[PDB]
Amino acid sequence: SMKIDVVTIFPEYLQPVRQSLPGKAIDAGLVDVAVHDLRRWTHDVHKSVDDSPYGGGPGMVMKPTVWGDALDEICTSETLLVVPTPAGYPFTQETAWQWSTEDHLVIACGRYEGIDQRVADDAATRMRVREVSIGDYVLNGGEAAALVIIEAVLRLVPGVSLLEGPSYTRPPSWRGMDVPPVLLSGDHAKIAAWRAEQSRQRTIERRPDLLGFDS
């Protein structure tokens, strides 16, 4: 049984956890996902969570005070605090396997130009903290990255390289395009070999890095 808490100023954006794979995992009781509005930990009537950056720069930075109070309430020393950010360590399949065995993930979703660095620094004095990037692109906030991380982790929880090549299903001919004959041949060895080859050939074309080549 895993607990996932997500902290965000847009709790509505996390509603997709209730569908597909995470929804099934929740219904099966293998995971509990709770979404928290960060503004719950504010005290002004304006419910401010952001302020201008020290040292200059565009945009706003999320205040450490509000985050600190939120994480104080939600986290324990056993928590794995996950902070999605384009500046993070890469989140990979290996990371997903690692986190699949955790009792408690707390995902802090930033907005504006990110979260005051002291939030992660302070949290790291009492729990494990992981700032991670899900890919080399910029979002407006961490919420979609939280959903990706939850999807990647939950499908690996007990109870739930190379690129996969093309797959096919019925009918054997469609619009004049035939399924590769070897796949219809029932020869397990030949099919295995063809699939292995297709995998390695797609990998060299689409992801040469995976095989130790440039680009």
Ligand X SMILES: Nc1nc2cc(Br)ccc2s1
DSSP 13-25: GGGGGGSHHHHHH
96 touches which of ligand X, its own copies, none (CB within 5 to 8 A by kind)?
Answer: its own copies
Smallest distance, Å, CB 112 to its own copies? 8
Q: Which of residues 87-126 bind ligand X (CB under 6 A)?
A: 110-111, 114
Instruction: Assign 182 to helix, strand or coil.
Output: helix
Between residues 22 and 84, which has the closer beta carbon with respect to ligand X? 84
4: β partners? 33, 105
Among 84, 91, 105, 123, binds ligand X (CB under 6 A): 84
Instruction: Assign 104 to helix, strand or coil.
Output: strand
Q: Is 150 annotated as a binding residue?
A: no
Among 122, 127, 157, 200, binds its own copies (CB under 8 A): 122
177: β partners? 174
Among 14, 66, 70, 85, binds ligand X (CB under 6 A): 85
d(CA 199, CA 42): 52
d(CA 142, CA 5): 14
- Exposed / middle / buried, residue 81 (Cβ in 10 Å: 0-12, 13-18, 19+): buried
Among 28, 76, 206, 211, binds its own copies (CB under 8 A): 206
52 touches which of ligand X, its own copies, none (CB within 5 to 8 A by kind)?
Answer: its own copies
Smallest distance, Å, CB 184 to ligand X? 24
Cβ neighbours for 108, distance < 8 A, ≥ 6 positions apart: 7, 67, 71, 81, 82, 83, 115, 119, 142
Q: Is 167 annotated as a binding residue?
A: no
Q: Is 35 annotated as a binding residue?
A: no
102 touches which of ligand X, its own copies, none (CB within 5 to 8 A by kind)?
Answer: none
Binding residues for S-adenosyl-L-methionine: 84, 110, 133-139
Binding site for ligand X (CB under 6 A): 84-86, 110-111, 114, 137-139, 141-142, 145
